[PDB]
Nucleic acid binder design. Structure first.
Lengths: 254, 135, 29, 25, 52, 92, 98, 76
RNA sequence: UCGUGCCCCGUGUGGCGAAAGGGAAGCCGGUUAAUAUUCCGGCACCUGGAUGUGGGUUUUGCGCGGCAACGCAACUGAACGC
């Protein structure tokens, strides 16, 4: 039939660069990175990156085109746009001097610094990422290490103090479940921290907890993306705690 | 007065190295049996070092300062002599007529030429020889 | 000490010389 | 080359880098 | 923004217009087709004019 | 001979040569108590490493995100300062 | 409350089912929390501590050897450049029918 | 179609995976023998003088490769 | 990272309009009552895509040879230009 043209099929259709993905979703870079963390969109590597983009370098990030197409349907995008428009309305009220209207509109923002909870709700994301409770139990190692670490950190704009208090509360609830079911198995005093190993429904769960000292936040880490991980993991640990308490027939939350 | 002598800088005008800059190692005005005309034994640059900017890292500078040399027997009619001169002690008798009869001797000669030329380039002198001609 | 391989390549923006630099042309937009 | 002093030097360099990272009208 | 309609314009999606029972009508029983059966291991069918 | 040549958990201490992101990850800092620094009680234990940095490195190594560097200053928009018309036309 | 585990793409793509990249040199998946060994104990056994100390000692030895070798190569390169510059300055001063 | 002039190349071609079949043509008027191996893209022909060693080349050819003699008449 | 931005570029504008202009690539033999460079057999080609093997190049990192015209199975090459 008609002769095909070069660069219209194959890897050039299979991959997108991060710039193309961000323009395709019409997002800002922080929102895009946050959404990729929350939905599990991972960087990919083509065989020949020039076939995808002629200006690509070794530091160019690639993603699957189908993964970006899937991100097009996520309901959090409208939540992002609603929060941006609400912030514009609050700015209008403050600039006109309507302090009561500004307070009333700010109550709809659901800011973490007053709620202790993430700014956006990730409940629908949890079931998509973990089809089974066994999958959630297998990701509990990373979840518990991150949350037990962040329970001992100072307040920041990325993770406010009330969110840190909620992290501590969730870790304490999980510890109480382990106590009343006698699920804790091993512990280890290393030079880095205290390792704990428990067994929940046949799954070994190993996590690392810092010694209680002043923890050092260095510029070598991306602390805001670590905060996005914290939001996702506290949303996961709340549901894990509810399921475990309901399974052993206790009222949740304690 | 004769100017096609040792250390004379010339431009190659024909062949695969046309446009490249060479330094005359040995002039043969009377010719030989294999090349019965006035010719020269020259060493030159095939790949010039790239430009160096002030914000480049040391590894990048070391990578971009490399020189690929070549050696050549070339007719006088295929050279354009320049007023520049390049005096290098390490290139004295680096090549002769019998160098080109054996591939390994050409390899050793080109290694010696590369070492001497990169030393002179890193010294910062004779910058006209190490910049490429634009045409 | 600065690298001896660093060089200055000044541009002359007079008539018929190097290409004119990108200026603020907001008065003529 | 004493390995104890080499390891001490590497450690002190690492803590130095870590502390540097953590630090009219 | 993409469209997010408050009502679908069409309530029921259409069934596939060209299914297999409409694509294949009947085989050809002519003597040329009957030749082709053992000469070329080829069957001849009368099909829908809009089927590729 | 060609057939013989073709015939013949991950550890984070040894990484692949190719980078994932803007730079290849550095080698981990030394997590070891030196013999002169060895203590005999849990009270005088000197904790080693950084757990937040460890979690970030674990994220990059397992490939949930690529390694990026901090940008302390962003390039500003090129603007020109001018005086307002009312302040130009003010007279006293 | 809400209890999970009990045209939009209601199915995830297979590209999302693809596993992420591992940066491990063997290419296998690294655990989120690797199991610690006895050499990482706060009060370690003597054999584990001595093994870790010997490994880090030989790594420090080879690192310092490599650093001194590359420092010497840089020194020789600088000296060769300086000698070539001195030679160039001396040459400039000397010039000044079948 | 391509003509192979080296026995080592012909043996490698016959050992290739896409070598579907092979045939032997005898031309007694010119006293020659042709070995033709059918691959995916090309038919490769090795031309030899008719000789006992040319006959023994068939035993050096791979056994899994089907090898047939060309008949005197090409019946359809 | 003052995270919700910034930079570069300039040329305009879409479509129809040729079975004789331009244009990627198929030949031979046989075959029917009636089609055939279209079917059958043999032997090929073009365009596009993916990813291997061999071979090549590289520790003097991006081939070598010929005075030259140039040659050889390979022998990096974005923007912007000729």
């Amino acid at each position: 039939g008609k002769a095909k043209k070069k660069g219209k099929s194959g890897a050039a259709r299979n991959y997108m660069t991060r710039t193309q993905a961000v323009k395709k979703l019409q997002l800002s870079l922080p929102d895009f990175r946050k959404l990729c963390i929350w939905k599990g969109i991972y960087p990919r590597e083509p065989r020949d990156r020039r076939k995808v983009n002629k200006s690509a370098t070794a530091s160019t990030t690639f993603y699957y085109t189908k993964d970006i197409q899937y991100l097009l349907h996520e309901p959090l995008l409208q939540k992002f746009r609603e929060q941006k428009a609400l912030e514009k309305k609050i700015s209008r009220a403050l600039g006109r001097g309507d302090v009561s209207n500004a307070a009333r509109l700010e109550r709809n923002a659901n800011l973490p610094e007053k709620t202790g909870k993430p700014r956006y709700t990730l409940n629908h994301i949890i079931r998509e990422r973990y089809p089974t409770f066994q999958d959630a139990l297998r990701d509990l190692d990373d979840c518990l290490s991150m949350l037990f670490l962040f329970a001992n950190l100072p307040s920041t704009t990325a993770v406010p103090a009330k969110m840190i208090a909620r992290c501590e509360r969730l870790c304490h609830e999980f510890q109480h479940y382990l106590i009343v079911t006698h699920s804790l198995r091993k512990s280890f005093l290393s030079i880095k921290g205290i390792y704990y190993q428990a067994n929940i429904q046949g799954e070994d769960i190993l996590w690392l907890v810092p010694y209680k000292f002043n923890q050092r936040i260095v510029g070598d880490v991306d602390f805001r993306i670590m905060g996005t991980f914290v939001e996702f993991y506290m949303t996961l640990l709340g549901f894990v705690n509810y399921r475990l308490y309901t399974s052993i027939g206790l009222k949740y939350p304690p | 007065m004769k100017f096609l002598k040792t250390s004379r800088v010339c431009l190659v005008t024909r062949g695969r190295y046309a446009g490249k800059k060479v330094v005359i190692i040995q002039p043969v005005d009377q010719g030989t049996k294999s090349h019965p005309y006035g010719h020269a034994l020259v060493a030159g640059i095939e790949r010039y070092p790239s430009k160096i900017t002030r914000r480049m890292s040391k590894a990048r500078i070391e990578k971009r300062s490399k020189i690929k040399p070549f050696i050549k027997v070339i007719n006088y009619n295929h050279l354009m002599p320049t007023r520049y001169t390049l005096e290098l002690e390490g290139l004295k008798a680096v090549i002769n007529a019998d160098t080109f009869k054996e591939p390994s001797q050409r390899e050793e000669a080109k290694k010696t030429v590369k070492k001497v030329l990169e030393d002179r380039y890193n010294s910062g002198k004779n910058r006209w020889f190490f910049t490429p001609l634009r045409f | 000490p600065k690298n001896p391989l660093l060089e200055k390549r000044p541009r002359n923006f007079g008539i018929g010389q190097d290409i004119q630099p990108k200026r603020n042309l907001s008065r003529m937009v | 080359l004493v390995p104890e002093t080499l390891l001490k030097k590497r450690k002190s360099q690492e803590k130095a880098r870590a502390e540097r990272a953590a630090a009219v009208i | 923004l993409s469209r997010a309609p408050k009502y679908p314009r069409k309530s029921i999606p259409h069934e596939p217009r060209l299914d297999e029972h409409k694509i294949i009508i009947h085989p050809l029983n002519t003597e040329g087709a009957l030749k082709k059966i053992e000469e070329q291991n080829t069957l001849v069918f009368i099909v829908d004019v809009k089927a590729n | 001979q060609l057939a013989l040549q073709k015939i013949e958990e991950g550890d984070d201490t040894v990484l692949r040569r190719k980078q994932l992101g803007k730079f290849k990850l550095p080698e981990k800092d030394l997590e070891l108590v030196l013999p002169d620094e060895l203590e005999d009680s849990l009270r005088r234990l000197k904790p080693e490493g950084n757990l937040l940095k460890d979690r970030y490195r674990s994220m990059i190594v397992r490939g949930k995100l690529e390694a990026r560097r901090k940008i302390p200053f962003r390039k500003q928009a090129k603007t020109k300062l001018t005086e307002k018309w009312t302040f130009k036309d003010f007279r006293i | 409350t809400y209890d999970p585990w009990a045209p939009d793409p209601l199915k995830k793509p297979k590209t999302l089912e693809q596993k992420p990249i591992s940066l491990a040199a063997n290419g296998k998946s690294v655990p989120a929390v690797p199991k610690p060994t006895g050499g990482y104990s706060y009060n370690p056994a003597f054999t584990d501590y001595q093994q870790r100390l010997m490994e880090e000692s030989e790594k420090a030895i080879e690192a310092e050897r490599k650093r001194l070798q590359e420092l010497e190569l840089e020194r020789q390169k600088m000296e060769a450049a300086a000698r070539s510059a001195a030679e160039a300055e001396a040459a400039e001063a000397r010039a000044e029918k079948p | 179609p391509q003509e192979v002039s080296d026995i080592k190349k012909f043996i490698e071609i016959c050992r290739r995976k896409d070598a579907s079949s092979a045939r032997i043509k005898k031309n007694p008027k010119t006293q020659q023998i042709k070995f033709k191996v059918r691959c995916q893209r090309f038919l490769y022909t090795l031309v030899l003088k008719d000789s006992d060693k040319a006959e023994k080349l068939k035993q050096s050819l791979p056994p899994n490769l089907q090898i047939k003699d060309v008949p005197k008449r090409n019946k359809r």
